[PDB]
From TrEMBL, chains A, E:
Full protein name: Genome polyprotein
Higher taxonomy: Viruses, Riboviria, Orthornavirae, Pisuviricota, Pisoniviricetes
Family that this chain belongs to: Belongs to the picornaviruses polyprotein family.
Localization annotation: Host cytoplasmic vesicle membrane; Host nucleus; Virion
Covered range of the whole protein: 98 to 309 of 2183
Role according to the record: Protease 2A: Cysteine protease that cleaves viral polyprotein and specific host proteins.
Subunit structure, interactors included: Capsid protein VP1: Interacts with capsid protein VP0, and capsid protein VP3 to form heterotrimeric protomers. Five protomers subsequently associate to form pentamers which serve as building blocks for the capsid. Interacts with capsid protein VP2, capsid protein VP3 and capsid protein VP4 following cleavage of capsid protein VP0.
TrEMBL record, chain B:
Intracellular or extracellular location(s): Host cytoplasmic vesicle membrane; Host nucleus; Virion
Section covered of the full-length record: 318 to 564 of 2188
Membership in a protein family: Belongs to the picornaviruses polyprotein family.
Protein name in the entry: Genome polyprotein
Record function comment: RNA-directed RNA polymerase: Replicates the viral genomic RNA on the surface of intracellular membranes. May form linear arrays of subunits that propagate along a strong head-to-tail interaction called interface-I. Covalently attaches UMP to a tyrosine of VPg, which is used to prime RNA synthesis. The positive stranded RNA genome is first replicated at virus induced membranous vesicles, creating a dsRNA genomic replication form. This dsRNA is then used as template to synthesize positive stranded RNA genomes. ss(+)RNA genomes are either translated, replicated or encapsidated.
Residues annotated as transmembrane: none
Species, as recorded: Human enterovirus D68 (EV68)
Self-association and partners: Interacts with capsid protein VP1 and capsid protein VP3 to form heterotrimeric protomers. Interacts with capsid protein VP1 and capsid protein VP3 in the mature capsid.
From TrEMBL, chains C, D:
Protein name: Genome polyprotein
Gene Ontology cellular-component terms listed: host cell; virion component
Entire-sequence positions represented here: 66 to 281 of 309
Annotated localization: Host cytoplasm; Virion
Keyword Hydrolase among record annotations: no
Lyase in keyword set: no
A biological process term (GO) from this entry: virion attachment to host cell
Residue stretches making up the Picornavirus capsid VP1 domain: 1-200
Keywords per UniProt: Capsid protein, Host cytoplasm, Host-virus interaction, Lipoprotein, Myristate, T=pseudo3 icosahedral capsid protein, Viral attachment to host cell, Virion, Virus entry into host cell
TrEMBL record, chains F, G:
Family recorded in the similarity comment: Belongs to the picornaviruses polyprotein family.
Organism of origin: Human enterovirus D68
Compartments in which it is found: Host cytoplasmic vesicle membrane; Host nucleus; Virion
Protein name: Genome polyprotein
From-to range in the entire protein, with total length: 318 to 367 of 2188
Quaternary context: Interacts with capsid protein VP1 and capsid protein VP3 to form heterotrimeric protomers.
Lineage: Viruses, Riboviria, Orthornavirae, Pisuviricota, Pisoniviricetes
């Protein structure tokens, strides 16, 4: 339903549905590294384990379950090669806090995207808007996005799907709760 | 066999010149280029992408809380919701946008900007706003009736959720450029109160975007003052050792 | 509209290294690894302005043009008689990745036929050579969301690819009875630039060259 | 009839600046803002002959060609032995309006990639570069019947436009044990000249550069 | 009636008539800065106040009311960008004595035009001659005369209309008096 | 590859010469010229004014 | 007769360059080449041998 096709281009229907995240009035955001997630869980994971080279392009679907009395705005942005940095330290981020798996991570400085850039200019990336008064879903298609025809899924993440609440969720009762569901479907399913 | 004479300015290193160079490592074939999706050949199409503005101009606001302005049930009729000075190369709402960051790399800019506002309240929230634009020569209005004298648009966000207004063509260099600002303002006033059902939240938020049109131009590239030369970064002698 | 093209936006010659080294005949064993030669790995993160300008696209493909401008100053010691500054010849050797970098001024690596070298004098127009695109991938990776090695110890953000190479400059002349101070100034200018996937600019001044850490 | 064209009438190379600066190693903090470098804002009212010749048309549009001829004289002190005049390299940087002008010889502004620079030696043919037409308006305003700023304090006759830029020249070499006197001679020659609205000539010799006051 | 069209070219009929000036046997001259005058008085003035950019070209008409027994010659000259200087001082002229409004100013050194040039060579500018034995009127049309397509009327004067008596007015009785009337009509009346 | 020899009077600065110069700040487009009314191309038409 | 100016990087010895050289001992005819059986023009066919 009115998907965003990233950069102008167009390259099996498994749609691995991740566990829903809890959107509160104090949430900062969530992110998933696409090759890091979606593996070791399904047939895509077993193929990624059995092969050194894999092909992708993905298909992201994000859904929100909210009533007509809920308000808030969500920015769904896919960042290519989102190399994130640490905070108040010169050491590099480690494997444990870079590779979060299917659980994913949470932003601690969403205003700078944990990189030092600006969240305001994040719209330059392929993105969609979720305003809980006009729409409650967003679909993004992604390209290959690599400098080389081959890469190693276990060591390099191609895309980073980020969901950041620009406008905090609100209702008359301050116990608001809206679940967000993310579904990822690899495309062309090539593994060699 | 060919009689020649040297010209003035021969054997000088000019940092901005286009001369063919001797190819070190010839007969070496570089890796053939393939199609990487998404390619920018001109910086103009970068600034034609909408970016969030820091509408909330209060100095107390920091972080994500300065990206939105709050319309409360006690905001009261006839109150200046926000004021946006229209000066790209100036600290303010447009300082941290894509158009501002790219324009800070140049000296002369000219073109028309487009501004979009999105209402992010409940589905049943209703109300009206007055969006006023003032030409570069003038003063920002303070009250509703003097705001209504100039060009304005009444935005009923009960039905519409987004409004777009186009700033007319403007040449920033002529208008001052260290004439030794006031290039224009965009203001918002509350025509009515904000009406929300009891179950919904009594506070709604507004966000704004800015982008350049296809007539935007930039000239005389300079050095951006955004980030200063750090005396020395952490790992700097590794390249030399 | 031609001024705001990516080629004109990025193809500006910028100073990338301004190291200087001593030349005098060190009879004693002191000041190791910089006795008479200067070594610099070709990167772009050294200078904040160029680093921020380059860190606007995810992928880049360009050829680097190197100009080496060198000046000699009278040794700030000994006799002050301005006998003159002798015409010292210099050797600049480009060492691509996967090759051996010299460790001393008189190592045999300076005579290797595989590494391309440029011999120039102190009283000539500055030396100039252009390094081609030398990556195994189709483009350079300004940002790399991955680990270099297959072991977990591999550093984050460092791509085993790229790494254009090293630049080594030395004084060919055998030590004169009087030493001198040599300042080497090298300028890099990208050419035939291609860019992909533009990125938001960088606020929050850099805290390191290896990574993208911030102080928020 | 070709000799009396406007292009031939105005396109004559004329000396526009003849400043000289000292070079010696000033250990003490003295002679500020002119320790080792020379700065000059590009204008045409400095010399009376060229100013009067130009002040015959209301509007002009031309490209300025700059030739920098520099000579070094033996430091008029210390030992008189003619050891020679060392080959000092110089840097001439053109700073267009809206950019930052260096304040000292060792400021970081000399390394900016935005400002175009020319490196030349003392024993080479004089450096030469041509500055294009760099006004936001369609032509330069020799006369301006208006005030610059929107405040009443704004000076009369000064146009915020025009103001071609600044020219900065320095000695790249680090201070030799013996100082020297450097004389910088810069010549400007307009090219591709277009003129509008001729004016009566000027009697009553000039009393200032900023304005057109007279002593009648 | 036989107008002078300035430089060869050709680009509403309000004809704001200024107050008449008194031409005596000892008069030196009068000048008006065209954008400086003609504003804050009429609809052109209100438009100039309401707009930062304005378009012009003007139309000057000068009339003299003299009998057949009067003698004298008048030089009516329009000077583009007449930047005037001060006398016996290095300071620049001020706003108060540059912007005289609709009242206008008077020359104190008409032989040098308050600039340091020559009044003899002032005929190089668009000009007309008023000899009180052949004609008593002069009409001058003016072009845009600006380096930029836009300018600020409140800060920059485009034209300077100068009226200088080369031959002093004379009659048998030394109480001579001839009034001079100046009418200015803006052209194309563009304000944006 | 081309054999050349320097001529007398090489590397001299002649103040009256017409030689192309290296354009500082290339790829910079100057402001396009518009029609300003009244243009003098030859000084002869100036002296033909009384 | 031809006005020229020297470029940066002039009079430098680059070890990897393809420039014609002055032939020492010109007008000397080398021994004409005959057909020697077995000729390698590309190193690739060398590595294609088991």
């Amino acid at each position: 339903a009115n998907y965003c096709c990233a950069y102008g281009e167009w390259p099996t229907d498994r749609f691995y549905t991740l566990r829903s995240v809890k959107w509160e009035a104090t949430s900062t955001g969530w992110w998933w590294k696409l090759p890091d997630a979606l593996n070791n869980i399904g047939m895509f994971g077993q193929n990624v384990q059995h092969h050194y080279l894999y092909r992708s392009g993905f298909l992201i679907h994000v859904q929100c379950n909210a009533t007509k009395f809920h308000q808030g705005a969500l920015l769904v942005v896919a960042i290519p090669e989102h190399q994130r940095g640490a905070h108040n330290t010169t050491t590099s981020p480690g494997f444990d806090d870079i590779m979060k798996g299917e659980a994913g991570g949470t932003f601690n400085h969403p205003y700078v995207l944990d990189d030092g850039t600006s969240l305001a200019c994040a719209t330059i990336f392929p993105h969609q808007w979720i305003n809980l008064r006009t729409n409650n879903s967003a679909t993004i298609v992604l390209p290959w996005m690599n400098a080389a025809p081959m890469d190693f899924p276990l060591r390099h993440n191609q895309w980073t799907l980020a969901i950041i609440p620009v406008v905090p969720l609100g209702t008359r009762t301050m116990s608001s709760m809206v679940p967000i569901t993310v579904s990822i479907a690899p495309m062309c399913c090539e593994f060699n | 066999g060919v009689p020649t004479y040297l010209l003035p300015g021969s054997g000088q290193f000019l940092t901005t010149d286009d001369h063919s160079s001797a190819p070190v490592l010839p007969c070496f074939n570089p890796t053939p280029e393939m199609h990487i999706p998404g390619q920018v050949r001109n910086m103009l199409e970068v600034v034609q992408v909408e970016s969030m503005m820091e509408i909330n101009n209060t100095e107390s606001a920091v972080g994500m809380e300065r990206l939105k302005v709050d319309i409360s049930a006690l905001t009261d009729v006839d109150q200046l919701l926000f004021n946006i000075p229209l000066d790209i190369q100036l600290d303010g709402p447009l300082r941290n946008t894509l158009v501002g960051n790219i324009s800070r790399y140049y000296t002369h800019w000219s073109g028309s900007l487009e501004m979009t506002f999105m209402f992010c309240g409940s589905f049943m929230a209703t109300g009206k706003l007055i969006l006023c634009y003032t030409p570069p020569g003038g003063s920002c209005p303070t009250t509703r009736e003097t705001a209504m004298l100039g060009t304005h648009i009444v935005w009923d966000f009960g039905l519409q959720s987004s409004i777009t207004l186009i700033i007319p063509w403007i040449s920033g260099s002529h208008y001052r450029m260290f004439n030794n600002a006031n290039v224009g303002y965009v203001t918002c006033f509350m025509q009515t109160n904000l009406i929300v059902p009891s179950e919904s939240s009594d506070t709604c938020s507004l966000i704004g975007f800015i982008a350049a049109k296809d007539d935007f131009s930039l000239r005389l590239m300079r050095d951006s003052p955004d980030i200063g030369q750090i005396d020395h970064l952490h790992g700097a002698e590794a390249a030399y050792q | 509209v031609s001024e705001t093209l990516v080629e004109n936006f990025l193809s500006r010659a910028a100073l990338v290294s301004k190291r200087s080294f001593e030349y005098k005949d060190h009879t004693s064993s002191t000041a190791q690894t910089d006795k008479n030669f200067f070594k610099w790995t070709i990167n772009t993160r050294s200078f904040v302005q160029l680093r921020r300008k380059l860190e606007l696209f995810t992928y880049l493909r360009f050829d680097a043009e190197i100009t080496i401008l060198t000046t000699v100053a009278v040794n700030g010691s000994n006799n002050n008689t301005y006998v003159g500054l002798p015409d010292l010849t210099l050797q600049a050797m480009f060492v691509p990745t996967g090759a051996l970098t010299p460790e001393k001024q008189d190592s045999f690596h300076w005579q290797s036929g595989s590494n391309a070298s440029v011999f120039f004098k102190i009283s000539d127009p500055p030396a100039r050579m252009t390094i081609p695109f030398m990556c195994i991938n189709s483009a350079y990776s300004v940002f790399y969301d991955g680990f270099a090695g297959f072991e977990k110890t591999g550093l984050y953000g460092i791509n085993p690819a790229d790494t254009i190479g090293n630049l080594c400059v030395r004084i060919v002349n055998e030590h004169q009875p009087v030493g001198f101070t040599v300042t080497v100034r090298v300028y890099m200018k990208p050419k035939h630039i291609k860019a992909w996937a533009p990125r938001p600019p960088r606020t929050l001044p850099y805290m390191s060259i290896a990574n993208a850490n911030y102080k928020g």
